[PDB]
Design a protein around this ligand. Structure first.
Ligand SMILES: [Cu+2]
Length: 258
């Protein structure tokens, strides 16, 4: 019924309800490190996540989510390919069923265990709603996740996952710090893209970080136990909720690093 990631409602079906699914700037895409090119005009990336603004954590049937207070500029994104200030409004995790898959964007065909997305909107549009209606309304920072050492900033979250196991559930969480999710390096690739889930609006400036972060298998496994389904329904594990790479058409992927 509702769009999804199954065989009967997965990505390859979306185009029937959202013709833009076959647009000219769809995400995610595969990053060919030796096709993408350094762009000397890109300014430095500014990830000012000083004042934490996390509010809720929830299961919306599509993925694990975190909502932030976007009333002020307490967590914004500036610099890089961006013109203006972009406000962080939410974050979600794309998880795989196996350690070898999960990420939406790929690097030279390589898939990661998962991909985190931090969504920000151009504060020049009044609100999120009017932003997505614009080509330069969104800025999504994508962060790759590989299995290994445990990520501290994720434990506290992983500890209360059972409180949002099924769709429609949510738990207050003012404890979430998007700083604890960032890798050491802020090198990235940027390209004009879209949302990776319906409506698939082509309103996104993508900033994918080259350096992945590590998470333990315990943390991963706990994320693989969320459910696509609601309470009192046949269990459907929330895994492989990622859209495969889309045609780059002839878009240019730029590197922030030489
Ligand atoms: Cu996403």
């Amino acid at each position: 019924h509702h769009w999804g990631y199954g065989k009967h409602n997965g990505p390859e079906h979306w185009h029937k309800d959202f013709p833009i699914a076959k647009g000219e700037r769809q995400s995610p895409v595969d990053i060919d490190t030796h096709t993408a090119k350094y762009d000397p005009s890109l300014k430095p990336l500014s990830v000012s996540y000083d004042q934490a603004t996390s509010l809720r954590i929830l299961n919306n049937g599509h993925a694990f989510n975190v909502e932030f207070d976007d009333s002020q500029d307490k967590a914004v994104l500036k610099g890089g390919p961006l013109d203006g200030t972009y406000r962080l409004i939410q974050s979600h995790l794309h998880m795989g069923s196996l350690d070898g898959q999960g990420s939406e964007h790929t690097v030279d065909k390589k898939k990661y265990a998962a991909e985190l997305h931090l969504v920000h909107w151009n504060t020049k549009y009044g609100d999120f709603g009017k932003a997505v209606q614009q080509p330069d309304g969104l800025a999504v920072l994508g962060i790759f996740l590989k299995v290994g050492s445990a990520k501290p900033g994720l434990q506290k979250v992983v500890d209360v996952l059972d409180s949002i196991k099924t769709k429609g559930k949510s738990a207050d969480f003012t404890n979430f710090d998007p700083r604890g999710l960032l890798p050491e390096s802020l090198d990235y690739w940027t390209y004009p893209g879209s949302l990776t889930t319906p409506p698939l609006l082509e309103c996104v400036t993508w900033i994918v970080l080259k350096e992945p972060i590590s998470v333990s298998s315990e943390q991963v496994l706990k994320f693989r136990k969320l459910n696509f389904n609601g309470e009192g329904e046949p269990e459907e594990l929330m895994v492989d909720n990622w859209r495969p790479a889309q045609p780059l058409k002839n878009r240019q992927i730029k590197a922030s690093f030489k």
